[PDB]
Each structure stands twice: as structure tokens, then as C-alpha cells.
Swiss-Prot record, chains B, C, D:
Species the sequence originates in: Lactococcus phage p2
Keyword Nucleus annotated: no
Family: Belongs to the skunalikevirus receptor binding protein family.
Official protein name in the record: Receptor binding protein
Keyword vocabulary terms for this entry: Host-virus interaction, Viral attachment to host cell, Viral attachment to host entry receptor, Viral baseplate protein, Viral tail protein, Virion, Virus entry into host cell
Length: 149, 263, 263, 263
């Protein structure tokens, strides 16, 4: 948020600065140092399957996605611990043709046995947010059901 | 790069202080981490059925101050509910949300420096089928480096560094030392002493350097099932000097407790 | 309803912080209630006749910070003057005033949540008929829940919990146990022992659970007016075993101090 | 004059709060002086040869908050460097600057009230010819008046006030008393007692008032080189009453340790 004289917490004007306690206008914090760290993959309605293209950061460190509910608790997580940095991990949660494959160059590797089976509790994603574990970039395509249209 | 905050801004644009910057500041002042809170009930919370209403309760979680004004939270029947303060900075309209949970799901997420949702338990509500039975609040941890205090009042207990050592003095003597706060030591006598004279040193092992006192401590003991006693001299160099009656080949059981100061 | 204070305002209007909200925030950090203060004399106050001039003193009362810069308080002669900081928020232009009173009239009024004048004593100034004879500051109380600290320097005294127990051990033996910090116990022997044998359990009351040690403790005692001694074992189950010589019908006085650790 | 700060300005001019005014407040809340700091490493500082880069370290020096974000400090080859935080308020653009010095040059200059540059050490860096060997941070002192706490955990040591006394009880008996925290006293027996009967008060000096107990303390001692024992009753009036066997003209060496509580 923008910095305003009298409204924001700053020691301005006459030395050695001054911030006044008013009623309603008083002092409101401008923002946060390094606000670029905050990112939210918002989930507003219940989704049933997805096709994510995950680009990993560090090798040998579990890389993938984790899902949190409305109270900040993890319910499921698709995460993989590979030996080398994959160019991308192509994941499809579709039941009919489930795919968990890693790509390096022109070579396709099945990443299913390397995956953490304990964290992946459900496929059904609930209302909340999604976090990126050891990922530099991610591209998601979400498919959500409607009974009558 | 140095980011200054509690300083004068000439053109009223110089040192803008953010909520995370003040958040980090407030944490360091009280001495708290992302796993503990600062909670105060200005007015006692009301319990109606399987619900708990916080009439007026202020909470400082992760250095962020917020007030609960008549905020009611639903509870689970016949269960131990762990009330959590949930902070999500991405939810710019309403960052703080409350939740009654099955277990203490405190994460300790660094919201001020990094991303994520911070969860921290502050109250433990025990319920029945109808309403609330008992309420126990979470402890407020004050992590500090050094204290220069005049007076102190403790309602519970103080945990001091405890060190234990078992020295086989010799001639049939065993000493069980228990050093607390690196000062007070209570020595327990064990075994059965045989073949020793008055004023003579002990044949076996010597007392280790951390358990050695500043001056020669005369520790009194007793012979089990008798009306005769003894005393040993633990010299500052670690040596143990016998000062009881002369003991012949027959071994007599030695028991007793003797306390001394190191400093 | 939840009120959010230490959070960013996207349109610079969402989260305004009031003086009472910061007052409550500052109290919770330092661990102060409405019956104490935070006080610092940056420069020494000056006494002139029956007056005290606070040259440069900072005070925090009810989480509210204010400075006393060349502020003189008139005193009563040949009296003990209790100097109070009085906060009345309805007095918009001058909310703080100082008074010299005949008694400590601290009222603990919650000025951040409700109405009323907060009165808090911070100094005690004793006078003669002509001027100040002595000054004593009021103690600054830091109320905390739990402390994890490396080292501490105490100039006064630490008050730890104390529990006492009198045990009629049997055979005429009496133990008076004093436990401090729920750990260190000093046993004082009383009474007179008769009709007991070595290795035999004493015929009376066992030691109560809060005084029972983790391991067997041998405590040396002495027979009054004699050159003879005994010892007893306080077993972890609470039972007491006699380890002196066998005693006949005639009672012998038992005295002495013995120490042990419960933990 | 009274300068009010945590209050309202209805005309938006009445009570303005500056950097020094808040700086003084923060110091009082945490209990720090101009010689100590509040430091927290959110991410460990990197060491590249004779240089130290502070990735993310927040510091509160003289009540003034600042963050070090990837700030590198130049180091001296094969020397014990002292990293100082230098605050010069005259430098409106850059008040805080860092320096690695030969010795600890903490000045403790009052910047919030008076003029000057505040220098304070926070980290000690031991280096070799190539790079950093070891790092030790300066202790964060928390000066407090009184603490009302529930539970405490000490990793180092508590320094309680110690008092020594050497009272010549008489008849040839010497006592070495050591009182810590005005409660626990360990009496050390010395000398050689002669010409005394059972239940008779000892001829020499009486126990001083700060060492006198609340009740009569029975303390057991031992005769060096023998299997005979004794006990002395230290009554609340300071009088030492002998309670061993009747001793003639020949003096026998008395040694032993006895613990008792005053309170």
C-alpha cells in the first residue's frame, strides 16, 4: 500500500520525526518489507482433478505441491524426491489415466515410485490454498464438475 | 544492505515501517517465537452450550496484535478442543481466523520473513455432551539470553543443570554425586569398606575436575546396622582421605548422605 | 468479531491502530498490569525544599508512555509522600498529572478497556520539616508465564515454593521434612526410638507421595548426649527402614539434619 | 512539563511521537541499556574467506530497530574481530553503519536523550589467515526489577548472593558457615573440642543474626580418626548447645558438614 503523511507509520516532518495517534485515521502500516514473497494459489470451489506442469528447483530435496484447508492444515500432498533436477514434472490427477512423470531433455521418467505415499491422502481438493514445495515455476489446469448445465 | 526503521524520515518517505518489520520488532522485545503467543483475557470468556465466546481477549501471535471482541467459536462434543489463531497474510481483508481443533497443530511458520499460514494454539477447551467442563490456556514462553534481576517469586519450579557421577573411591567405597546448578552436590555412600587406616588416602579412583570443591569438605557417613560412624575428606585436588576408625579385612556396609558447595 | 491491528492496510484505511490498542499491546509485551509501572530516570531528579523535580524521567503506566521534563511535585513536610501518575483520558489536552499522597492509592483501573482515572504510585519520597531526607522507587513488576534463559544474576532473593510434612515414622521416631522448589528436602529428626532391629521397617506412617525420592536415600542421625549414631533409609515407595543398631524397650532421643534430592 | 505520547491528538497536532520517544519506550519494555542489544538471526550469516555476510539479521540497538539484508562485513586476517553497530543520528540518510574492530569498543552513548554516536558489539568473529574459524554472539542483557514467574529453565547458572561466617563456638570448636540466597547454609566443623558436658551451652561466640535459623537446627558432626559422633543444637537466639558425650581435658578433632534452612 502507498505511504501517506499522517496516515502511515513513519517518523516524518519536524526532526526527530513524528507519528500521531488520531481516531480512525491514526497510523496504518504501509505494507511489508519484501511483499514479493507472498503468493496465494487460491482454491474457491471443490475441484476433482488437475493437470499441473511443475518446474523443480533443487535436486534430492522433495519437490511437488501441498494443499491446505481454510484453517491452514494440510490434507493431501503430491511430492517427489528425485536424484537429479528434472526440467519439469508433468502430473495428471485424472483417475482414468493417472500420470506422474518427470522430464529431463527428451527423456520421460515415471516418478510414481519416488513419490511420498503418506502425504498423498486424497485427490479431491477442498476450499483453501496450494503451496509449491521446491518449485521455481508451476502451470496448473483445473477441472471442476457441474451436474446440470 | 541495511534497512533502518526506528529513525527520522526527512521527506516523510525515508523509513517506512511495515507490519512484518514491527511484527519482528515486537517478538524480539517480549522474547517469543512463532510457536508461542501473548494472550490476555480483559473480560472472562463466556461458555454457552458447545461454543466458547471470547468477550475481550487480545492476542499477539507472530508479533501481530489482534483483539477478539465477542468472537464465538464452535466446539466438538465430549472432546479436548485445541483453539488455534490462524494468520494468512494473503487474505488481506481478514488475516486472522479462529479454529477449534482435535490436536495442538501449531506449525511455527515464519510469516514475517517468508510465506505460509501461521497456526498457534492458545487455549485448551475440555467439553462434555452438553457444554464446557474445564479450560486450560497454553503457556507463554519468554526466551531470553541473560537476566540481571533483583527479586523473584516462583509458583511452580526452576529447572537447573544437573550432573551425575559415580566414583569408585577404593577399599570398597562407592560415591554417588549429584551436582545441581554447578554448585550444590549431595553425595550418597555405597559399598562395604575394608583394609584402611585413619588419615590415609583412598586406593581407587579420584574425584573428577567438575565435581572438585574449592576447599576440603568433610562428609559424614554411617555403618549400616551399627551405632558407629565415619567421615571422608574430599580435598580440592580430587583426592579422598579416610578419617574414620581403622578397618580390618572384614568389609562393613557404608551408607549415608552428605551435602557441600563447590563455589 | 475479530479486530486486526498489526497488519497492512491495502487502501490505507482498513486497519487503524488506536492508543488504547497499543497501550494493551505494550502491557502484554513487557508483562505489566495496571498496578505497576516501567520507569527510568535518564537524569537524576532534583530535591529543592519540599519539592521533587523530575528532570528527565520516562514512565509507562497502563501501557501509556510519557516523559517528565523538569516537572516539579510539591511535598508535605515531615511525611512519607507517595508520588502517583494519574491518567484521565477525558482530559484530552492534559491526560497525565502527578500527585503527592499520604498513602499508596494505586487503583488498578483499566483505562484501555473502560472509563475511570488510573492512579499508580511510582516513587516514595520521605521529608523532614525542611526538605527531602530519602527517596525509594516503587518496584517494576514483570509478570511472566514461562522462561527459558541461559544465565541469571540475582541481587536480592528468589522465593521458591515450600512444602512441609511431619511424619510419625513409628517406634517413637519423628521426621520433620521441608521441601523447596519441589526438589531439595531437609529432614530434621525428633522423638525417641525403642523396640527396633537393623533392617526392619518402622511401624508407623509412610512418607507422603510428594516427598518420596526417585532412589533410596540414607539419612544419618545422632543419639542425643551419646557418641552413637544411626541411619534410616527413605525408600521410593515411602517406607522407612531402620539401619542403626538394635534398640531395646528404653527409648533413646533421635536428632539431626539430613538432605536429599527428589529428582 | 509532562510530554504525553500514547494519547490522542483530536486536532492532529497535540501528541506527536518521535523516533527517540519510541526508542526510549522499546528500551524500557525489553529492559535493555545502551551497552546491550536485541539480536535475532532469521537465516544464518554466510562466511566467505575474510568476510561475513548477514543474510537476514534484525537488531535493536539503543531502542532503534534495523534489518541487515545480505550486508557483508570486512574482516582482519588472523585476528579476533568485534562486529559493532554504529548509530549516528546526524546521518539522516544512513544512521546505522557496521565495523569490525580489534577490541570491544561499546561506548553506551545516550542517543535518545543527548547527542553522539552509539557503538555496541553484537558478534565476535575469530579469524585465521584464510577465513573464519569460529563465531560467538554478545549476550543479550535483560535488566529487570522483579519477576513473578510460573516455571523456569536454566541452561547455564543462577548467581545467588553468598555470605560467609566463621564463629568460634567455644571449648575448642570452630564453625564455617556459607549462606546462599538467604536460606540454605552449610556448616563446616573445625578445631578440637575439650571440657564440655551434654546439654551445656558452649562458652565462646554466638551465631550472628543473618545466619540464625527460625527453629532449633540439630547438626551432626564426626570425631576424626574415630567411630564416635556428635551433634550441636543451633537455637534461634544464636546459642550453640552441645549434645554429644561428655568430653574431658583431652581435645578431639571435630570435622563434618551440616545443612539447614533459615526460612
Amino acid at each position: 500500500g502507498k505511504v501517506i503523511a499522517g496516515m502511515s507509520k513513519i517518523y516524518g516532518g519536524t526532526a526527530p520525526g513524528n507519528y500521531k495517534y488520531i481516531k480512525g485515521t491514526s497510523y496504518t502500516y504501509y505494507g511489508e518489507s519484501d511483499i514479493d514473497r507472498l503468493s496465494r494459489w487460491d482454491i474457491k470451489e471443490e475441484i476433482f482433478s488437475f493437470m499441473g506442469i511443475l518446474y523443480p528447483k533443487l535436486p534430492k530435496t522433495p519437490a511437488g505441491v501441498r494443499f491446505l484447508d481454510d484453517i491452514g492444515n494440510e490434507y493431501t500432498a503430491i511430492v517427489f524426491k528425485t536424484e537429479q533436477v528434472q526440467d519439469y514434472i508433468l502430473i495428471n490427477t485424472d483417475v482414468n489415466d493417472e500420470t506422474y512423470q518427470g522430464w529431463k531433455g527428451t527423456t520421460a521418467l515415471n516418478l510414481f515410485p519416488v513419490m511420498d505415499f503418506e502425504r498423498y491422502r486424497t485427490r479431491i481438493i477442498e476450499k483453501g490454498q496450494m503451496e509449491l514445495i521446491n518449485l521455481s515455476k508451476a502451470e496448473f489446469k483445473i477441472k471442476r464438475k457441474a451436474d446440470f448445465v | 544492505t541495511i534497512k533502518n526503521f526506528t529513525f527520522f524520515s526527512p521527506n516523510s518517505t525515508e523509513f517506512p515501517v511495515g507490519s512484518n518489520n514491527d511484527g519482528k520488532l515486537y517478538m524480539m522485545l517480549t522474547g517469543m517465537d512463532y510457536r508461542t503467543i501473548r494472550r490476555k483475557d480483559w473480560s472472562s470468556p463466556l461458555n454457552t452450550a458447545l461454543n466458547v465466546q471470547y468477550t475481550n481477549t487480545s492476542i499477539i501471535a507472530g508479533g501481530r496484535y489482534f483483539e477478539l471482541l465477542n468472537e464465538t467459536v464452535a466446539l466438538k462434543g465430549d472432546s479436548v478442543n485445541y483453539i488455534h489463531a490462524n494468520i494468512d497474510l494473503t487474505q488481506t481483508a481478514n488475516p486472522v481466523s479462529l479454529s477449534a481443533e482435535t490436536a495442538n497443530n501449531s506449525n511455527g511458520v515464519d510469516i514475517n520473513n517468508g510465506s505460509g499460514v501461521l497456526k498457534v494454539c492458545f487455549d485448551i477447551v475440555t467439553t462434555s455432551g452438553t457444554g464446557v467442563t474445564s479450560t486450560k490456556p497454553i503457556v507463554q514462553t519468554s526466551t531470553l539470553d541473560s537476566i540481571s534481576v533483583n527479586d523473584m517469586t516462583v509458583s511452580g519450579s526452576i529447572d537447573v543443570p544437573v550432573q551425575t557421577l559415580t566414583v569408585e573411591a577404593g577399599n570398597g567405597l562407592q560415591l554417588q554425586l549429584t551436582k545441581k546448578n554447578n554448585d550444590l552436590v549431595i553425595v550418597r555412600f555405597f559399598g562395604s569398606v575394608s583394609n584402611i587406616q585413619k588419615g590415609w588416602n583412598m586406593s581407587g579412583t579420584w574425584v573428577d575436575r567438575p565435581f572438585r570443591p574449592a576447599a576440603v569438605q568433610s562428609l559424614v557417613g554411617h555403618f549400616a546396622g551399627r551405632d558407629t560412624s565415619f567421615h571422608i575428606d574430599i580435598n580440592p585436588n580430587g583426592s579422598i582421605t579416610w578419617w574414620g576408625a581403622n578397618i580390618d579385612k572384614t568389609p562393613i556396609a557404608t551408607r549415608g548422605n552428605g551435602s557441600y558447595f563447590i563455589k
